[PDB]
Structures are given as structure tokens and as C-alpha cells.
Design a binder for this molecule. Sequence first.
Ligand SMILES: [Mg+2]
Ligand SMILES: [Mg+2]
Ligand SMILES: [Mg+2]
Ligand SMILES: [Mg+2]
Ligand SMILES: [Mg+2]
Ligand SMILES: [Mg+2]
Ligand SMILES: [Mg+2]
Ligand SMILES: [Mg+2]
Ligand SMILES: [Mg+2]
Ligand SMILES: [Mg+2]
Ligand SMILES: [Mg+2]
Ligand SMILES: [Mg+2]
Ligand SMILES: [Mg+2]
Ligand SMILES: [Mg+2]
Ligand SMILES: [Mg+2]
Ligand SMILES: [Mg+2]
Ligand SMILES: [Mg+2]
Ligand SMILES: [Mg+2]
Ligand SMILES: [Mg+2]
Ligand SMILES: [Mg+2]
Ligand SMILES: [Mg+2]
Ligand SMILES: [Mg+2]
Ligand SMILES: [Mg+2]
Ligand SMILES: [Zn+2]
Lengths: 60, 155, 118, 81, 127, 99, 25
Amino acid sequence: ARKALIEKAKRTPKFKVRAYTRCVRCGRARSVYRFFGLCRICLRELAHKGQLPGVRKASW
Amino acid sequence: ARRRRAEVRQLQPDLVYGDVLVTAFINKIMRDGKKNLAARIFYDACKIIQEKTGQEPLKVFKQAVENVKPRMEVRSRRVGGANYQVPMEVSPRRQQSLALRWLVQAANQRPERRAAVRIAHELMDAAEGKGGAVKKKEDVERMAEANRAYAHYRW
Amino acid sequence: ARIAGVEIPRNKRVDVALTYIYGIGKARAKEALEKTGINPATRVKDLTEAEVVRLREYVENTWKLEGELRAEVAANIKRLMDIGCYRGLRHRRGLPVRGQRTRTNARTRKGPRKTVAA
Amino acid sequence: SLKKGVFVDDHLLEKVLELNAKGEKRLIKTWSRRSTIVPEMVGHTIAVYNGKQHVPVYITENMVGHKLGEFAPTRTYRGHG
Amino acid sequence: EQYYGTGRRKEAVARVFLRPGNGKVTVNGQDFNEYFQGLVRAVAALEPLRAVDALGHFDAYITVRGGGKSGQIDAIKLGIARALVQYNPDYRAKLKPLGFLTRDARVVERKKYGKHKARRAPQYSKR
Amino acid sequence: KIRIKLRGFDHKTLDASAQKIVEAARRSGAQVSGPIPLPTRVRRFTVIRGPFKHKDSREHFELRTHNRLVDIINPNRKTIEQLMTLDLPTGVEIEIKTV
Amino acid sequence: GKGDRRTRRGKIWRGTYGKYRPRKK
RNA sequence: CCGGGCACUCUAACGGGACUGCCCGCGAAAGCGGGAGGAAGGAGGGGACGACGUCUGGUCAGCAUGGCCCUUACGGCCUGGGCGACACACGUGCUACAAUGCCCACUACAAAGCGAUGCCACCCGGCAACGGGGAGCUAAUCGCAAAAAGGUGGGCCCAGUUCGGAUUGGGGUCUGCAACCCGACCCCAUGAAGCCGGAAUCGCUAGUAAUCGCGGAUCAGCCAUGCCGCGGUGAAUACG
Ligand SMILES: [Mg+2]
Ligand SMILES: [Mg+2]
Ligand SMILES: [Mg+2]
Ligand SMILES: [Mg+2]
Ligand SMILES: [Mg+2]
Ligand SMILES: [Mg+2]
Ligand SMILES: [Mg+2]
Ligand SMILES: [Mg+2]
Ligand SMILES: [Mg+2]
Ligand SMILES: [Mg+2]
Ligand SMILES: [Mg+2]
Ligand SMILES: [Mg+2]
Ligand SMILES: [Mg+2]
Ligand SMILES: [Mg+2]
Ligand SMILES: [Mg+2]
Ligand SMILES: [Mg+2]
Ligand SMILES: [Mg+2]
Ligand SMILES: [Mg+2]
Ligand SMILES: [Mg+2]
Ligand SMILES: [Mg+2]
Ligand SMILES: [Mg+2]
Ligand SMILES: [Mg+2]
Ligand SMILES: [Mg+2]
Ligand SMILES: [Zn+2]
């Protein structure tokens, strides 16, 4: 996303309903995992390099 | 079935009458996976073959099944020139299933409001011969009668 | 026999036949049945011309019914229209009044589809 | 709905309550369509905003519980062909 | 003093206790025909009994959990199957050809991304 | 009456960890009832595999919290001091209480 | 069926509770 | 529930275990059939895994990034609106058209996940949504929780109906600064189209397809019938 936008996300005050979570890697507003604070593309990205602790691709 | 000869699904025999051809029938009454409902229907039907008729309901069943077993049918085949309609004999396995199918379909068409009463009469009528499910069996054999001309194109 | 307006139900059940009255059903029905202490499982065919007037007098008097009821709902909407309000426009134009989506099927409130070219 | 509630923005609620006891009543533009209307709003002319422009709306007693944005619609239509 | 077997079908697990008696069967502190009342296939739960000829020779105390009533029933079946093969394990002779000695490895297949039920796939479009 | 709750994201380390504490108690003191695995709590993340739009074709990952419990009945102060400074964990977590 | 919120089955479907699907156990 | 034991079930780590390795048949071997094994075979069932490349495939709106382009704005803040528009047209779906079905009552049997900025037992208030109160749980230890179909009992009696619940009227609950545009939910009233769907057309070969419920992610709340998953019951049919 844009800069003024990736900022305003963090300026959280004024009517706490407005705070929306955002990716702390991207700026990406959509599909941001509460847990990691990452967006879905970055979670796939970091998890692949191993840089996500105890996070391994599953199967069954 | 490109590689295989496609082996036959083999059924666990009935609990009460102790019979495969029943369970195989039971299945065909089963709508959306409820086996309970199916036998609790079929069984409630044999109840109806009883107080109503003085026979022994399994024995009728084996009969109504044999009465509804189509002896020959007509399958399509593709030849030089047009696509045809050729008479051939039904396999043992097939008459089995064909019979089983028609019984239920015809049965469910009879107007009677409860279900088990429909299988009751249809299994009765079929056995006694006048069944609407037998009408179908005949109508098929006739088709293979009328096409006896094309009887030399069979495999 | 007949309850408010004309509205004669019959045979069936008493609790069921009561639904056939406009303004009434299910809840409002099983309500007036123990409020007149009348058996609901019974059939309107037979019952004491007493518990018939018991049963009529209650309902007709308790809450408002088919004649004056419909007349009220008519008047609510007239009010909602012509006041100029947005609920009222979607009554005026025959389009769905509470949210929903008109890009595709509104059909119940829109009538049957009337097609055109591309 | 609300109930322990009945929310009305106080921007205009001032100028409304004020135009009751001032002695004067005249034309007031607001952006608050989220608010509810009346009782002391009645007789008063209010200009709501649809996203496009401020729209005059005359206020009467049967407009009571209704939000202000009801009488100022947000779109333009006039049919298709 | 008593005889035991283990069996499970499809997430339901069965603990089976067998001591000789009249032929009473108990299922999780219950009479068999109360707990399983109204279920058609109930009696096939103890097949190897009549297939071993032991009729009212054994009583049964059985605990069972997991899965569902009607697949629990093929679970208990393996209990009686491995219990009756405990007392005089010549009963393997005719038990296994009847099939009563195998576990049904058939379980719910999972789901796959992009599919719908795990085989069933969403309707095709083309247009 | 004194109990240890063990957690960690890798069971290759988590096992080899509780196994040291077993002999840092058994050998060094009073009884400790053997390592019991508590069931594993699984956070799972299923996600669309590409950046743009292919909704079918997701990759998924999971994060395993594995729990392992060991109970201690009778305190010896060589146990405790072993259970104080003799610590050799890394990505494991440890907890103790007197209840 | 599953769409009538005035019944047990309806409520269950929608996942709600009320006069027709009281919360009790 | 207490003592007690963990033996069983299980929980979860480590191994074992089938390799056409054995017998007969075939065969030149590889392999194929067939039998006895065994819990399991002929790669046991299911994942994860995608060759050189193709589609100048997709994405400059995740990100990165060469080039081009705007600079009191092509940047930046806000309030309000729109993305939710409706003569229509298509894709994917949900709920149905009922009696193997609907309703009410009682009665059972799962799995996987979530939760101490939350999940909330239990008592009261309320028809109810929900609201007061208020205990336990950093959680195999308390809670979400009722699984549902099933079972039993009774009712409806073939009717556009105790089918079906779309539309609309009035009354409210909750979140939220705020629900006109645009929320979800409860109740009373309303009860529409629909009596298995033209040409055409999709999925599925087994614990599958049907069908039945349950959980999570996002998330204040929710337009989720979606999506990723979990188990319950459980068919049909392959000549070729
Ligand atoms: Mg938000
Ligand atoms: Mg977000
Ligand atoms: Mg709209
Ligand atoms: Mg297991
Ligand atoms: Mg899709
Ligand atoms: Mg399933
Ligand atoms: Mg497509
Ligand atoms: Mg209904
Ligand atoms: Mg063998
Ligand atoms: Mg091979
Ligand atoms: Mg490979
Ligand atoms: Mg860019
Ligand atoms: Mg801008
Ligand atoms: Mg704005
Ligand atoms: Mg959109
Ligand atoms: Mg849908
Ligand atoms: Mg009609
Ligand atoms: Mg709105
Ligand atoms: Mg009809
Ligand atoms: Mg259709
Ligand atoms: Mg296949
Ligand atoms: Mg949510
Ligand atoms: Mg759901
Ligand atoms: Zn990101």
C-alpha cells in the first residue's frame, strides 16, 4: 500500500473501531494473520526460509 | 474400465433373512445413506406380505425378482454407416441389478401414501405377475424382439 | 363457524384452522387455546357453540384482524411513501425495501423478468 | 436499533435547540445523516448532504424516529431506456 | 476368570470383557438392547459367537467410545473376535475365513484444497 | 507435589530436554514420575499459494506446541540447585509450581 | 426445513437459539 | 467420587512390520495370475512433492524493480457518499417443491480445533435475542458443547398443505463514535415463487457419491449459503 496509508494504520487513535490490522512487512491490508502480523504472502515467504520458528509445511 | 475387468462389489448378507439379494435390494431403497430407514421399510413391508397374504415373504421376493429379470435387452452399437440398436442377452449380474432397480422405481410410483405399503404390493403384484415393474421387464424384451433383424450385429 | 370478518375455517384441527385467519397463526393460536382453555387437538367441525363464541369473542377482541389490520399496514406504507422517505421510495417504485441487492434477483418484489437486448 | 441510545449528533443539536429559544428559525446545512430527527427539529428547514450536495428538507411530525439521511437519497436514477 | 479383545472401526474404539454366563451383554453400563435399541444392524456386532457356536456360553461387559453407534458396532465385533480367539486359540481356524479377524482400515478421506468434499469437485463452467 | 510443565516447538529438542531433568532428579534425589506427553495443540495456517489469484492451490503449514509433563514428589536441595543453575535448554520453555 | 428460523432445524442451521431452539442441557 | 493401580483406552515420541521376501502355475529373465500369511499386500489407502519447456499465460494494486509521467498535486488530512446502483444477461451456490417427508417431546454415539485484552459453566430476569450477577480454566485438569442425521413416543393425512419460508408490517436485542444509505440476531404479524425443471449440462469408482452436523482462519460486528478442515451414517455401478 501507499506510505501515508501504511502510517495511518499505526496512528491508531480516534474511534478505536478504525484500527485495522496491516502487514508489518508489506503494508498489505488484506489477509493479515493475527498471530504473525504478517500478510498471507509473507507468511508463505518467511516460513519457506525457515525464519518462522517451529513453522513447517504440513501434510496428511 | 480400460485396464481392468472391473470386479464386483461383494455384499454382506442380511441379518434377519440372512441373504445377500436382500441387502442388495435394501440399498436401492436407501435415499441419501440411511440404511436404518431402508430396512425398517423393507422389513415393515414383509410384515405386510404377512397379515395380508398367507405366503412367506422372502419366498415371494425371490419370485418377484425372477419375474422382473429381463431375459434380453437392446444396446446401442456404432458401425460403418449409422449408430444401431442391437438385441443381446442380459448378463446374470445385470438382470440382478435391472430387476432390483425396476422394483423400487415402479414401487415408488404406486399411489399408496406410506412407503412400505408400496413395496408390499409391488413385490406382491410383481410376484403374482401383474406388477408395473414387470411391465417394464416385458417392454424391454419386446424391444429386443422387434429388433431381431439387427440380431447379427452383436458382440 | 366464522371468526372475525367472514373467514370460516373447518374440519382440520382447531389450532391449525385458526392460522387461516389473517393476523393469526402458530403462536397467537396456541395462545388463545389455553386462554379460553379449549382443546387445540380438537377439530373445528365439532365443538360447543359455546366454546365457539368463547373462542371467537376472544380473538376478535384481543388483537386486530383481517379487515382493520390490512387497512393499517396499507396506511403505514402510504405514510412511508409521500413523507418522501427512502423506505417510501422503494415502496413507490416497487423495489426491495430493506437492503438486499437489485443487480440480480429481486424477483419476488420485481415481478417476472422482462428481458431486452445486449 | 438502539434504546438506551437514540443517538443524534451534537453539531446541529446545538443550532436546533438554539433555534427554538432564540425566537428565530432558518436554513441549516449539516453532514449528519446518522442522527435521528425531532421533536424540536420540526418546523425547521435542514439541508442534508448526499455525498454530492446539501439538500433542503422540510421537517414534520411524522418524520419522527427517522434518520436525516432518509429524506436525502444518495444516488441518481430515472430508469434505464 | 475372564477373556478380552480389542477392536476399532473408524475412530470408535471397543474394550470387550468376556466371562462365561447366560449370554447377557452389557455395553457401557447398559443392556445391549437398550443402548443399541432401534438399530437394525446391532446383532451383527457379535457375529463370531454363533459362528463359534458359543451361544449363551459367555456374558459380556463392554466399554466403547469414539466414532458412532453403527461403526462402533463393527468395532465390538473385533473384540468378540479377538476375545473368542483368546480362550482356546484354535478358533482362528474358522474365524478369519469369515473375515472377523481384520480391522477395517477404511476411514474418512480428508478434504483437498480446491475440491469440495475431498473427491467431489466444483461444477465445470466453460462459459 | 512439585510439577514441571514443558513446552517447545521442536520435539527433537523437547524430548532430549525433559530426559536430562529425569536424571537431574532421579540420580540426584527423590522420586520423579516418568515423562508424560500431553497432547499436542496445533495452530494451523492454510494459505493461497500465489500472490494474485489462484484460489484453488493453497499451501498449508502448521505450528506445533508439544506439551510434556513430569511430576516431583519429595524435594532434595541437590535436585533444586541442579534445577536452578544446571539448566541446559534453548528453544524449550519450563515452568514449576508447589501445588 | 433448514431455512425456517421459526423451527428447531432452522435455528440449528443458522446456528442460533430462541423460543424454537432454547439453550438447555 | 475416595483409596488404590495404569493393566486397558488413550496421549505422544521411538522402533517394528512385507519386501512378490514363501508355494504351485506361466515365463528366457522383468513381470503377470493364483494360494497360504497376516492388521495390512503386489506402490495397503491419503497427502506433500510438479522434468526441459509452453501458453510474448497471471500479477508494476503484496513486495521488489529499469523506463515514462504529476509536485500547492496524479501527493497529503478529513467529513459525507460510492464500491451494496437495476430493463436485463451469465457463472458458482444455498433453501425447496415434501409422507424414505414436516413438527413437537424425550433419548443416545464423534472428531478436530479454538479460548484468562478471551471462552463463560451455574442462578436470576426475560417468550426470546440478550441482560444482570457470577465460579473454573495460562487449560487432556475449566469453557465453547447442543453434535446432527439416528432412536423412541406421539402429531400432521396428500392439501400450494403443520410442505416451502421469499416479501412486507410493527416490536425489540447486541456490537459499534455511529447501523438512512448498507449490519447480524429475537419475537408477533405476513406468507410469494415453487407440485423436479427447454435445448443443454456437472461431479463422483468406496469409506467415494449422496446426506448430516461440528470447528477454525479473517473478525468489533457481519451480509459465511463462501473458504480451509473434522468426524456420523453410508449406496449404486463398470459389459466394454
Ligand atoms: Mg476493522
Ligand atoms: Mg486485516
Ligand atoms: Mg443494495
Ligand atoms: Mg487415533
Ligand atoms: Mg472455488
Ligand atoms: Mg464427510
Ligand atoms: Mg474456473
Ligand atoms: Mg415449516
Ligand atoms: Mg490370503
Ligand atoms: Mg509392480
Ligand atoms: Mg516423487
Ligand atoms: Mg509497485
Ligand atoms: Mg489520493
Ligand atoms: Mg472517507
Ligand atoms: Mg465487490
Ligand atoms: Mg451461496
Ligand atoms: Mg402456483
Ligand atoms: Mg445501509
Ligand atoms: Mg404435493
Ligand atoms: Mg435444476
Ligand atoms: Mg479415479
Ligand atoms: Mg467471525
Ligand atoms: Mg459454518
Ligand atoms: Zn506481507
